[PDB]
Design a binder for this molecule. Structure first.
Ligand code: CYC
Ligand code: CYC
Ligand code: CYC
Ligand code: CYC
Ligand code: CYC
Ligand code: CYC
Ligand code: CYC
Ligand code: CYC
Ligand code: CYC
Ligand code: CYC
Ligand code: CYC
Ligand code: CYC
Lengths: 162, 172, 266, 75, 162, 162, 172, 172, 172
């Protein structure tokens, strides 16, 4: 999946070349970013449950119809709420994976690829998940490089959804 | 394509000379500006869908003839192609901002675009208007002072505006 | 495929491969990369000597005189391609090599073998090769500017399912090539419209425990059996035997007249 | 303008040893190329060098893809 | 050319994708390395003439036959020495270009591609230029990141020649 | 556009064949269906305004939040209601086109292709259009072959949306 | 490609209008005349080889310079190409008759055919003469009253003649 | 492609006549010179690298602007391309000498070369001068009486000179 | 394998819950049908040899290429194998009827049969034809109203027909 190190190696291999100073600079950028990414993943992991619950409630607040219309795709009952919380937890966990990996590769491999026809087949509105990601952006409480990288992943997911 | 370093490298190799001290110092000021360049690129990328969709909505509110039946933005296929074109132009503008050179925007995006749009009957003037709307949204997103280390970003904003106007001029 | 099946099947690199497109106003290194990719994929990943390179064809590609599809056609029609894939190969092996190199897939039907065989017999090697490059499949998948790439491991439109399985018979791994005269592995599978189990990457290995012999090596013998003893219950049979009993299994398979289709290390 | 050496192939015939330049316009998204893996980059005048023996195929391709053959020039 | 920014944009464009955190990290590594590359290029430029003469003289010392064997490919006469010094100056100038660009792009674009056809055609031995580049790598007198990048480019040229 | 006549000619042309008896049977089936398709279109266009208004009203009734939520994608104001009525009218008109043509060709050419990017880009839920198409199914009053063909087109749109 | 129905459909979509009652009734009269159109297509494709061969033989009889050595129809390869073009024009005319629209003929057969013949030295005027000979043979075949339910087929014959004159004017 | 036999075959077939006695006697005279033609082809082939390299070195000795930085022969890739082109022209000249006809050299290498070189920014005059140097080296090598049966090779040398003239005039 | 009871039991255990009232009543309905089920098994078993032999004779009469020399049913060994295969299909169909579930017929007889027939060159379509002949004979045996307690056996006959059609589909 898409990370600076693996793509540097794949691009070099497709060109039949050794790793040169370009790939070394790529690794240096990965090292510069990696500690902030790791501490962002730790901060999101520790506050994961609160973030997921608050994001689900924010989605319910901005889309109240999801809480009282009956149907498989809605969260009116406990089964729908469990599915919704599980989906938002999926989003948050994959975002932490991206922060660990240093690229959107975890999001692409695990969530982004094929998300649209899933959302279509099960009649799941992407605006719900966009609102969940906006809550995660506004409530993760990160700063500096950790915030910047994490927000890049969150709004990468938002852009893919919208 | 070239970036900011390879442009002067290619010019120097054609002249057959070592980069002068002045050119090296200019490339050092570019290195100093590199952090703000990365921030601009990141800010435009993070709001790309919003920029494209809002600019398209504005471009169809005024100039409604595009979305009327028989218009060039009518039918889902043509509407999707128009949205994709705006996204492509924005993406290549971000590429040009990232590299610091407009060569990627010319060679890969704007080359043959006017002849393309003419051969399809696409109203290139309307595309230029949409590019201006994307430009204004992108510039006010880049110049957003909250959530970022304060600093003067006038030079990078001028460069981004130049890339956007260059795309608009190419399509017009 | 996704990672979990990709590592098992040894097709991770194919899945993560990105199609290479020669855009307008391409630089020298981009043309170099396109030429290298075409040589790698059309010539089936052989170590290409500099004396076997198509200097004029790649010059025409460089000066934008011809397209990627034209350069692919020139490499495919070249005497190097003929030497290593046509002049010492049977026709069925040759056309499956053409399907792998030019369309990036395994043959789907025996009718596709009947085609390109009659086509060869009427119009020569050049017409037979041009059939693939001028086909609708090449046009919709690669066009004039995308280097052909292997597609058999991914779901294609207008594809038969067997192709995926048959893909593992023509793609033997990333560090493999189509260099060595050889017979097609798909002859009986294509003729009788069947499928063979995929034994690729780590799928072929099986549990050993204490049942494997002295050297802890099991072998899978896929055979076709009939009644010549005990009752045969299936025409296809698989035998897992240790190395120390391999000769004994071969001889008892031999004296019953059963034909061995494949033997692999498990 | 080069290419003849590699485009014509090895028929050796005088009839195949002719190449022609096709000028094509209006290559857009049609229902015929909905499942095309690659994307169309230009719809203006593109020039395709076609040997004689493939002139039947290419124009059909062009005619199948909605392209308009505006001119054909001897090479 | 093989530079980190152009390579990042090329791999993003090949996938039709916006620049993500991976490409931003590539740019961060480029920024970390770029100033050191710029002082490396300045130091090589300031000492270019002496380095070129010393490398040419080193080649003449290790291969004395070139000093006194008649032939167009040898430096027996003044014209051969002028050609040799011009070639070594080409090598040093393109290495400075690589330091400025942050990758082996200038060496591939201007010197590496087609060098062996030239050497075979004009019957010039690559060992001469390999020892000359070795002299440059031994006597340029850089330190740290600048020395490592310059040595990477000189070793890239040496490996291509051998 | 996909229709029995054009499809028969395209299939014959891809094989370089004259129109055989198979193509004639295709044309015979087209003739057997065409009158009922034409009257289906005639009945749908005579009652088009009431069908479009009732479909819009049904969408508003099933999804009341589109009537009171402020947003560009919602029909809270008059602009959103006009856009919704215009979209439903587009669906009805293209369905009548399909009935006239005898195939899903107008839907594929004009509406189906690219509708995913539109619904995602402008944050329009396909479930709204599914309800509008269901209202058109339940209130078009067609019978026999005209019903069967019109409902085939309407379910084609629904299946494409879901 | 467009058939008789989709042509009206495309014009209506371009205008954003439902088909009017008059257009629906016109397409109803078109359906009412469909059996004759099918039978004319069947009659031409049933006698295609005879039509092509007789037209070519008459063409070489009245234009002997085509078949003289050095002529464009001389040698077996060029003769086969000539008969092949004859057959291709006839087949695409049958396609146009079948669909009821000329889109297949203009888009797939006559698209670039004139400058094809120009760039090859093919005497397109003689191609048009051969197409007229095919036209008269095919119109005589379609209008043959033997072994068929009798009715007036003047309209479909005029349409077929128009397709043939289209092809002949394109190649001339 | 044409050789010395198939060329006159093509004119006779176009005129639809058998080859006359004069044409057959001329071809017999050509056959009697075949050994000298094979010797000339062999000598140029056996000295191809030397001819190309010596001619290229002389072409860069005079006209120094080609190899100065910014010149067309500057950088390794462009020098390799120049050397390649000289060798390609020589190879097709040998092909023309072997076949006895200039069709291979014109159709595969010369026709369209002046336009390609203009659209690349390749100096046609300088490459024509290189072709002249290859001409002079090859003609000296062919006209070397040592180690070969003595005879009159004036006709084959004149033919080779004509082929070299063709490539110099066509590239400038 | 499974019978009618254990299939429902396995589904309930995977779902980890007691059988509902509806499932218990459905199994009670199966129990009420049991006497007719035993009747059908007994009737087919009692006429097995006649069913197999008559179906084989009919099959060889309508497919003489099976028994011609070189045919897959030619020679005594292959004829004995063909008769054995027909008997096996009938026996496992009776097993499936007796159990009330198709698991025995699928798991022990039909799974892999197609690949066996393809691998040894046995024509599966002809085996399917023999299976239809056995089907029609057996269903006539089951529905015979003589010497039995009259009642409606349509459900069990439909189940037996389904087993027979599963066999005929599995072979070809
Ligand atoms: C369709 C299958 C035919 C049919 C069947 C049918 N059978 C019965 C009832 C009985 N059949 C038996 C069977 C046996 N008793 C034995 O000793 C043996 C041999 C070991 C057998 C096979 C029994 C015990 C009964 C019940 C008592 C009775 O004979 O009436 C019925 C009646 C309903 C029921 O299910 O009990 C029916 C309908 N009847 C037809 O008309 C079909 C041709
Ligand atoms: C929550 C924001 C809203 C909501 C949620 C909801 N989701 C589903 C069903 C599914 N969700 C997914 C998503 C994923 N699966 C993955 O593996 C990943 C990537 C790692 C993702 C993002 C899928 C595939 C489904 C369908 C299969 C499944 O049920 O697991 C449902 C149930 C829909 C149904 O028909 O079962 C619901 C309720 N519902 C709301 O109302 C919220 C606003
Ligand atoms: C300019 C348009 C706006 C602006 C920008 C600005 N940024 C910095 C400094 C930094 N920005 C970054 C960026 C990132 N770190 C990450 O991890 C990510 C994701 C990969 C990004 C995009 C970094 C590393 C720095 C340096 C450290 C810092 O946090 O300051 C500056 C300061 C000057 C500089 O060039 O470094 C400025 C000015 N500020 C504005 O007011 C504009 C609206
Ligand atoms: C939207 C603001 C306006 C508009 C757009 C529109 N564009 C097309 C079609 C094409 N656009 C391009 C351009 C590109 N494709 C690329 O890959 C790149 C990089 C090289 C560019 C710049 C191309 C090539 C096409 C044609 C092929 C294709 O669609 O992929 C259309 C569709 C036209 C049609 O008839 O299909 C439209 C509608 N239209 C407007 O009205 C807006 C002002
Ligand atoms: C869903 C009910 C179950 C499931 C499915 C699943 N399938 C695949 C992958 C492939 N499926 C096919 C099948 C076809 N391709 C075709 O073109 C056709 C028609 C001719 C068929 C039947 C193929 C060939 C593949 C592999 C190639 C591809 O994925 O495109 C996957 C993905 C496996 C992976 O690791 O990526 C999955 C998930 N999986 C379940 O768990 C369900 C029970
Ligand atoms: C050298 C230490 C020994 C040796 C080597 C040898 N190898 C081959 C042929 C091939 N080598 C490869 C390997 C790769 N190709 C790749 O793309 C990759 C990267 C993933 C690998 C590892 C392949 C595929 C071949 C096939 C043929 C080809 O030309 O590519 C040969 C050539 C054999 C022959 O010409 O018949 C040789 C000689 N031989 C020795 O004796 C050394 C011990
Ligand atoms: C050398 C005497 C002069 C010179 C040469 C030069 N040529 C090119 C580039 C090309 N030359 C060709 C020509 C051919 N290619 C073939 O395959 C054949 C046979 C069919 C011919 C005749 C082509 C097509 C090109 C373009 C592709 C390529 O560059 O390889 C160059 C390079 C130009 C550039 O890089 O932009 C050069 C340098 N240059 C001189 O100064 C000499 C007078
Ligand atoms: C010096 C280490 C030894 C040596 C040198 C020598 N070189 C040549 C000739 C050429 N050198 C080049 C190389 C380049 N040209 C470029 O543009 C670049 C890339 C930017 C390179 C590396 C070339 C192309 C030539 C031939 C053309 C030319 O004359 O310029 C010569 C002369 C060869 C001849 O035949 O005249 C010599 C003498 N000689 C020694 O003895 C040193 C040990
Ligand atoms: C009605 C069911 C709901 C609704 C409607 C709504 N739609 C839009 C905007 C667009 N609708 C389309 C659709 C089409 N245009 C076509 O050409 C065709 C195919 C022939 C279709 C189906 C498009 C392209 C747009 C965007 C551009 C445009 O404005 O025309 C809006 C406005 C959204 C916006 O961001 O402006 C609305 C409100 N919304 C509801 O709440 C209804 C339940
Ligand atoms: C015969 C009445 C006249 C004649 C014909 C002639 N035509 C050609 C060559 C070509 N004709 C076509 C046309 C088509 N090809 C197609 O596939 C289609 C449908 C899409 C058409 C309309 C083409 C493309 C060619 C050239 C390619 C090829 O022939 O394969 C020739 C041969 C010309 C030559 O010198 O090679 C001839 C002889 N010539 C006459 O004199 C008659 C008046
Ligand atoms: C018109 C140029 C000539 C003509 C035509 C004519 N045909 C009909 C009617 C029918 N013709 C058919 C045709 C076919 N039936 C088949 O099975 C096939 C082969 C697959 C074909 C081509 C049919 C089905 C009909 C209708 C039934 C009937 O036989 O009457 C008519 C009558 C009017 C009508 O349109 O139905 C006419 C006028 N008659 C002439 O005199 C012309 C020479
Ligand atoms: C008769 C209708 C057709 C026919 C039959 C035929 N079958 C075979 C061979 C085999 N049949 C089987 C099938 C089974 N064996 C089992 O034990 C089971 C039940 C558990 C089944 C379903 C198998 C396994 C074989 C191979 C072993 C064997 O030969 O017994 C043959 C022999 C083929 C040969 O040449 O060996 C034949 C002739 N042949 C026809 O032509 C009929 C259409």
């Amino acid at each position: 999946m898409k990370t600076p190190l693996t793509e540097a190696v794949s691009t070099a291999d497709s060109q039949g070349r050794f790793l040169s100073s370009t790939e070394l600079q790529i690794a240096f950028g990965r090292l510069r970013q990696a500690n902030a990414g790791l501490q962002a993943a730790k901060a999101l992991t520790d506050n994961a449950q609160s973030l997921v619950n608050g994001a689900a409630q924010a989605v319910y607040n901005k889309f109240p119809y999801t809480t009282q219309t009956q149907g498989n795709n809605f969260a009116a009952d406990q089964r729908g709420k469990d599915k919704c919380a599980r989906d938002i937890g999926y989003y948050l966990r994959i975002v932490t994976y991206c922060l660990v990996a240093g690229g959107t590769g975890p999001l692409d491999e695990y969530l982004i690829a094929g998300i649209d026809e899933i959302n279509r087949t099960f009649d799941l509105s992407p605006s719900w998940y966009v609102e969940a990601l906006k809550y995660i952006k506004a409530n993760h409480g990160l700063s500096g490089d950790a915030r910047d990288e994490a927000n890049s992943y969150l709004d990468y997911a938002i852009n893919a959804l919208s | 394509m070239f970036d900011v370093f390879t442009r002067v490298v290619s010019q120097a190799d054609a002249r057959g000379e070592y980069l002068s001290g002045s050119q090296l110092d200019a490339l050092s000021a570019t290195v100093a500006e590199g952090n703000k360049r990365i921030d601009s690129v990141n800010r435009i990328t993070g709001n790309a869908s919003a920029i494209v969709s809002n600019a398209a909505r504005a471009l169809f509110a005024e100039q409604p003839q595009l979305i009327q039946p028989g218009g060039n933005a009518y039918t889902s296929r043509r509407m999707a192609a128009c949205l994709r074109d705006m996204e492509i132009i924005l993406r290549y503008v971000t590429y040009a901002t990232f590299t610091g050179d407009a060569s990627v925007l010319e060679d890969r995006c704007l080359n043959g675009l006017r002849e393309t749009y003419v051969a399809l009957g696409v109203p290139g003037a309307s595309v230029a208007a949409g590019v201006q709307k994307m430009k204004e949204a992108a510039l006010d997103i880049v110049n957003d002072p909250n959530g970022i280390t304060r600093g003067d970003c006038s030079a990078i904003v001028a460069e981004i505006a130049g890339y956007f106007d260059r795309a608009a001029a190419a399509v017009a | 495929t996704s990672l979990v099946s990709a590592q098992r099947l040894g097709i991770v690199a194919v899945d993560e491969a990105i199609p290479l497109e020669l855009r307008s106003r391409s630089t020298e290194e981009e043309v170099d990369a396109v030429i290298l990719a075409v040589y790698r994929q059309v010539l089936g990943n052989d170590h290409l000597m500099s004396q076997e390179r198509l200097t004029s064809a790649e010059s025409l590609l460089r000066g934008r005189e011809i397209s990627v599809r034209d350069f692919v056609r020139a490499v495919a029609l070249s005497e190097v391609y003929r030497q290593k894939f046509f002049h010492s190969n049977p026709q069925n092996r040759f056309i499956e090599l053409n399907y792998k190199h030019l369309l990036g897939r395994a043959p789907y039907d025996q009718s596709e073998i009947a085609f390109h065989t009659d086509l060869y017999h009427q119009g020569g090697y050049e017409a037979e090769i041009n059939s693939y490059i001028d086909s609708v499949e090449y046009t919709e998948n690669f066009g004039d500017w995308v280097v052909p790439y292997f597609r058999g491991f991914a779901t294609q439109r207008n594809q038969k399912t067997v192709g995926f399985s048959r893909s593992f018979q023509v793609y033997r791994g990333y560090a493999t090539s189509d260099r060595s005269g050889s017979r097609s592995r798909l002859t009986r599978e294509l003729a009788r419209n069947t499928a063979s189990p995929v034994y690729a990457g780590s799928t072929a290995e099986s549990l050993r425990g204490t049942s494997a012999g002295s050297r802890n090596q099991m072998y899978r013998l896929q055979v076709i059996q009939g009644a010549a003893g005990t009752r045969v219950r299936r025409g296809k049979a698989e035998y897992l035997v240790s190395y120390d009993n391999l000769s004994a299994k071969l001889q008892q398979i031999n004296r019953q007249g059963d034909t061995v289709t494949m033997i692999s290390l498990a | 303008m080069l290419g003849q050496s590699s485009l014509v192939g090895y028929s050796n015939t005088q009839a195949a040893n002719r190449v022609f330049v096709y000028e094509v316009s209006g290559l857009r998204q049609t229902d015929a190329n909905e499942n095309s893996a690659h994307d169309i980059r230009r719809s203006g005048s593109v020039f395709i060098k076609v040997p004689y023996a493939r002139m039947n195929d290419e124009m059909r391709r062009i005619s199948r893809l909605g392209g308009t053959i505006v001119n054909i020039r001897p090479y």
